[PDB]
Amino acid sequence: LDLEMLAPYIPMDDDFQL
Amino acid sequence: LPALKLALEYIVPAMNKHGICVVDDFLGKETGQQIGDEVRALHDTGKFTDGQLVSQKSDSSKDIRGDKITWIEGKEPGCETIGLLMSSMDDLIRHCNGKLGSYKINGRTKAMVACYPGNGTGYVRHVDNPNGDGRCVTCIYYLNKDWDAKVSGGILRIFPEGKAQFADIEPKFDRLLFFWSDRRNPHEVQPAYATRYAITVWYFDADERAAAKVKYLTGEKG
Ligand SMILES: O=C(O)CCC(=O)C(=O)O
Ligand SMILES: [Mn+2]
């Protein structure tokens, strides 16, 4: 079971600062 | 209730004790309906795309997750109420301070608006952040009225680490859900036989996220 290939994608850029 | 009272008096304890917290009737039927309509307009633009994976190794992403999604900042024309949702979530988190584990939450992703078309598709058992990409808390708002899992499926089943029994969360309308993103909470979206909508945001831990951004570019070698 390779969890990396199952994890949902998020962008590497464009975070939102709190 | 007041963001402060919900956070300190409910979210924080539930999260530190079980790693899962459910807040039903988060925003009320009126606001929830408005959000649902914004999501259905967005879907009706045809701009949704197949949900993707961190590092796809399978024939197609469809073998893993069968949803259609888009990303919203909350400031786009026609998404004002989704913006209100995201700002409410942020409010609760800010009011959680550093009382949610030992994380220092300073950022989050954009909102992932997601739709399981209802053709028996779902999301196999997975971990949102297995290998440390910064995601410390998952926050999901559901929008599906009078959803009966015995008829439509679509249960979110979580298997908290160590516990002998899983938990089945119905994707009910106006329901809010928090849970640890890491390997504590492997979860799955069981096959949905009806159109199933949900909005997700992932909150980041400052140090973990910062390291995650360098590990992608290189990761060195060993
Ligand atoms: O929609 C849900 O209940 C969960 C979605 C999920 O696990 C994901 O997209 O990573
Ligand atoms: Mn997930």
Side-chain angles (χ1 to χ4, degrees), chain A residues 1-3 5-18, chain B residues 52-55 57 71 94 106-108 110 123 125 127 135 183 209 213:
Chain A
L1 185 76
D2 158 39
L3 296 166
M5 75 166 195
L6 311 177
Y9 168 90
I10 53 169
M12 283 299 95
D13 68 346
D14 262 45
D15 292 8
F16 178 88
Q17 196 187 4
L18 287 197
Chain B
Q52 288 293 85
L53 314 159
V54 170
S55 63
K57 308 182 187 179
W71 302 93
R94 294 197 190 86
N106 69 339
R108 61 149 170 77
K110 301 139 163 176
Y123 200 146
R125 167 158 186 156
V127 171
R135 295 185 267 188
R183 305 173 83 101
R209 186 52 172 176
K213 291 181 185 300

Side-chain angles (χ1 to χ4, degrees), chain B residues 14-16 18-28 30-46 48-72 74 76-79 81-103 105-144:
Chain B
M15 280 298 277
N16 294 330
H18 313 286
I20 298 163
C21 181
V22 172
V23 176
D24 280 324
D25 308 311
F26 179 41
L27 292 164
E30 330 290 319
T31 296
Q33 285 185 181
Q34 191 74 286
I35 297 178
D37 289 334
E38 300 184 5
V39 171
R40 296 197 167 78
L42 288 171
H43 179 266
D44 292 14
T45 75
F48 279 21
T49 64
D50 295 352
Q52 288 293 85
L53 314 159
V54 170
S55 63
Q56 175 174 315
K57 308 182 187 179
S58 180
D59 309 35
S60 79
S61 70
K62 296 167 191 175
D63 295 332
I64 316 307
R65 65 188 297 188
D67 51 330
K68 320 290 186 164
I69 64 169
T70 182
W71 302 93
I72 285 80
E76 299 97 311
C79 302
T81 317
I82 298 168
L84 166 61
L85 171 61
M86 297 162 62
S87 74
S88 294
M89 297 169 162
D90 293 343
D91 203 8
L92 289 181
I93 291 299
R94 294 197 190 86
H95 281 116
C96 287
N97 305 146
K99 303 183 169 47
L100 284 170
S102 82
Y103 297 105
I105 296 158
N106 69 339
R108 61 149 170 77
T109 64
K110 301 139 163 176
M112 183 189 68
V113 175
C115 167
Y116 293 82
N119 299 319
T121 57
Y123 200 146
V124 306
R125 167 158 186 156
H126 66 281
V127 171
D128 283 347
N129 169 22
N131 309 307
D133 58 34
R135 295 185 267 188
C136 70
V137 168
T138 307
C139 179
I140 303 179
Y141 182 72
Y142 298 102
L143 296 161
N144 313 290

Side-chain angles (χ1 to χ4, degrees), chain B residues 179-195:
Chain B
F179 63 84
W180 302 131
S181 313
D182 70 351
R183 305 173 83 101
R184 275 170 281 185
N185 286 139
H187 58 284
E188 59 179 36
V189 176
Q190 297 189 333
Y193 306 112
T195 295

